[PDB]
């Protein structure tokens, strides 16, 4: 089972955590809970922004221009990236833009965080036909002492 996880600003703008103008410890914890003990797949740029692997997981970096890092697994195609994850229940795809696009037709589950924040951005989360997806979980939270904006956790399962 292939699942995507993403934080969406208004108009489905996506970016790197350290470049997005918000502070959302509840989202970090949401992210941690849903990716724990699962293999993760990410692109070149996401790998470079994240600085180190997510611990206790297998980290697969999908890139044409492979790197040398000894802690992750370097693949060059979508098929190769799925195989390198092995026979697990759920694979977590974490970005960035192109890699979301590539893994969507193969995806059966989405974890979205809808953040109420207007951010400038060139990259947007792939358009996904809402007829093909069903909401099974939604939870809205106001901004509070620690969280800079209101936000909505959503889980979508295909069909």
């Amino acid at each position: 089972m292939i699942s995507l996880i993403a934080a969406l600003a208004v108009d489905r703008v996506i970016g790197m955590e350290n470049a997005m103008p918000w502070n959302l410890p509840a989202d970090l914890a949401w992210f941690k809970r849903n990716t724990l003990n699962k293999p993760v797949i990410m692109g070149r740029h996401t790998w470079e922004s994240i600085g180190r692997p997510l611990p206790g997981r297998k980290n697969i970096i999908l890139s044409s221009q492979p790197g040398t890092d000894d802690r992750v697994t370097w693949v060059k195609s979508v098929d190769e990236a799925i195989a390198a994850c092995g026979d697990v229940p759920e694979i977590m795809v974490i970005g960035g833009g192109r890699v979301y696009e590539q893994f969507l037709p193969k995806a059966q589950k989405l974890y979205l965080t809808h953040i109420d924040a207007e951010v400038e951005g060139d990259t947007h989360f792939p358009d996904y036909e809402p007829d093909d997806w069903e909401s099974v979980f939604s939870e809205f939270h106001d901004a509070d002492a620690q969280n800079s904006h209101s936000y909505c956790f959503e889980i979508l399962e295909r069909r």
Partner: nanobody, 117 residues
Framework: QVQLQESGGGLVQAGGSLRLSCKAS????????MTWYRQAPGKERELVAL???????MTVDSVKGRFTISRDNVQNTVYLEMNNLKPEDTAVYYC???????????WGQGTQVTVSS
């Protein structure tokens, strides 16, 4: 070690100005989102302001127009310029740095701000 060190705190009267700084050591400062928090005794720490790696800022409503956050990557320092201070701003202010989803995140030891009136 201690990666982050705040300074600039102290006592001022209402309506006065103050400039806080947080100097980072031993880290690649430019790759961190920086945030200022504050905590009054017993009360929980609350977000004050953040600045991204590409200089996007956000300040919370209670300090809008009074506080300003900036960073100087060359000096490994983030700043909180505070103007028109009010007694309700009295707190220990804490600098925080975060790399991204996998961390690491660092906290300073904090600096006391007391406003009189």
């Amino acid at each position: 070690q201690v990666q982050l060190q705040e300074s600039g705190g102290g006592l001022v009267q209402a309506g006065g100005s103050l400039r806080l700084s947080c100097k980072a050591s031993g880290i690649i400062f430019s790759v961190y989102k920086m945030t200022w928090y504050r905590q009054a005794p017993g009360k929980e720490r609350e977000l004050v302001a953040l600045i991204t790696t590409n200089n996007n800022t956000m300040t919370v409503d209670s300090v809008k127009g009074r506080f300003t956050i900036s960073r100087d990557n060359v000096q490994n320092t983030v700043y909180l310029e505070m103007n028109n201070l009010k007694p309700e701003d009295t707190a220990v202010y804490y600098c925080n740095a975060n790399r991204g989803l996998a961390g690491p995140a660092y906290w300073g030891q904090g600096t006391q701000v007391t406003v009189s009136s």
